[PDB]
Symmetry: C3
Subunit: 210 residues, 3 copies
């Protein structure tokens, strides 16, 4: 699975977490990987190339089929209880992506803080697509094949509809966002994981949202 080449790399994967069929590659220096405890990080391909990169996955995170590329001085922070299917996260330009607590990311997600190539204005010659941090709030549910691009911030307890592309940030919590261009399509809601909970009151994990 794991493969390192470089100096002063710190890799602590809790011994209670599972990493079956996962590939971890670290090329470079002064990097840190932190996983566990009670994590299931399976069939993924995670790549850190450079210096001073931080990968932080908190307790109780379940990821399956993530392809992840991090360049120098980048950091990926995924908070506890977050679940993630197949997808891709790319970070470059010494930026950050953070994913809050108790998120649910369905298969097909694509998350990035960068276009990986420059676009310049012919008017003044300046670059106009610098990378920008992605912040994904607590208790966010991304439907299938959602794409989250650079600089986008998602509030807490928000649902993003299947196949939506987000180019811009939103400020309102407790809403559903869908369509193209992306927009608030429903307000004043809260989502849960279990359909067998008839009401939000039957879900202990939701107490805080109401």
């Amino acid at each position: 699975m794991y493969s390192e080449q470089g100096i002063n790399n710190t890799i602590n994967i809790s011994t209670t977490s599972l990493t079956n069929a996962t590939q971890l590659t670290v090329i470079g220096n002064n990097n840190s990987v932190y996983i566990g405890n009670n994590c299931k990080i399976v069939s993924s391909n995670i790549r850190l190339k450079g210096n001073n990169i931080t990968l932080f996955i908190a307790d109780d995170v379940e990821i399956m089929g993530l392809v992840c590329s991090l360049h120098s001085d980048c950091s990926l922070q995924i908070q506890a209880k977050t679940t993630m299917g197949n997808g891709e996260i790319t970070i470059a330009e010494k930026g950050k992506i953070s994913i809050g607590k108790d998120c649910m990311l369905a298969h097909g997600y694509e998350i990035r803080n960068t276009d990986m190539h420059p676009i310049y204005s012919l008017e003044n010659g300046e670059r106009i697509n610098h990378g920008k941090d992605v912040i994904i709030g607590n208790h966010v549910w991304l439907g299938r094949n959602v794409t989250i691009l650079k600089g986008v911030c998602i509030p807490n307890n928000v649902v993003v509809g299947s196949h939506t592309v987000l180019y811009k940030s939103f400020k309102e919590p407790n809403c559903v966002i869908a369509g193209s261009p992306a927009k608030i399509v429903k307000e004043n809601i809260v989502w849960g994981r279990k359909m067998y909970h008839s009401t939000m009151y039957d879900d202990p994990t939701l107490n805080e949202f109401y």
Copy 2:
């Protein structure tokens, strides 16, 4: 071939149909699987877990790489001569999805009567995204990577354009639906399978759609 667990489960797969490389799993009671004559249901993964589940696939249906998950009291019905490439069909909340005669589904389809997870109103705590049935009419062609969500009904003789997401129903037949949001972009058409034909009149399977 298939793995079956439980009581009063019935499985009828015609001996003239091919199921090469397909896994069929049925767990529960009172479930029924039917696959008619001269079908090719290949490289597929089909799961029935629960009670009173129905899977009915008529004659001359060809399916390649279907991933299909059905739960209790759910039913999937696919009528004769329909062809399907790689894709996913998910049915829960005791609902139903039906696919009509002579449909053509290109690789990439995602079809569901359900969101799989509850959305509650903050006003009164009630669930407001209950599952809803899906009905795909006769002679519907789905282009590549089309997504059909809960409650969607598609009229007969319709083409859905590549990468279209349908979140609500349409009523107009004989049209092309595409874009986002999904809308009728062309009217008064009929589609066929074979590019070699000069005109619709040359395709006997299309007689019923223009009279």
Copy 3:
């Protein structure tokens, strides 16, 4: 490769890499030219039919292309173009042309054909005949872009990720995105490397100003 039929000509430069690539040619009078210093890896290229042409110029890099060509079709890819994983389909005796120094990100789908007919009820005639696709020089396709029949893209254009193009554009030097597809930013030029504060530091970009 795997070549079967009469008078097929396959010329792949000895300076080019084809690691893990399946090239299958079934039919007659087909021709494949791949130029110098190419890397065509982990791809699956199928020519099924007769009188098909595939021309790939120098310094082209392709990783994970699934390509299907039918009789009398042609695919041309000009020098210095790079392409990730994706799919190209040509039929109805048509052609697709990709210009110089393009950059095609993972998930592209490019086709000159719908593969099945649509007829008008007014007269029974087919209204969706295949139509050539032309991608200009120095075009950058973001992730998961879909290019449908008849589409012509001007030089020096960026196509935003997940965009579907159904219609041609005329304006060079722009960003195209959204649905429907529209010009979302004018008067730009893209580059490959981000270690350049301005466009004047990229020698490759001079011909655009």
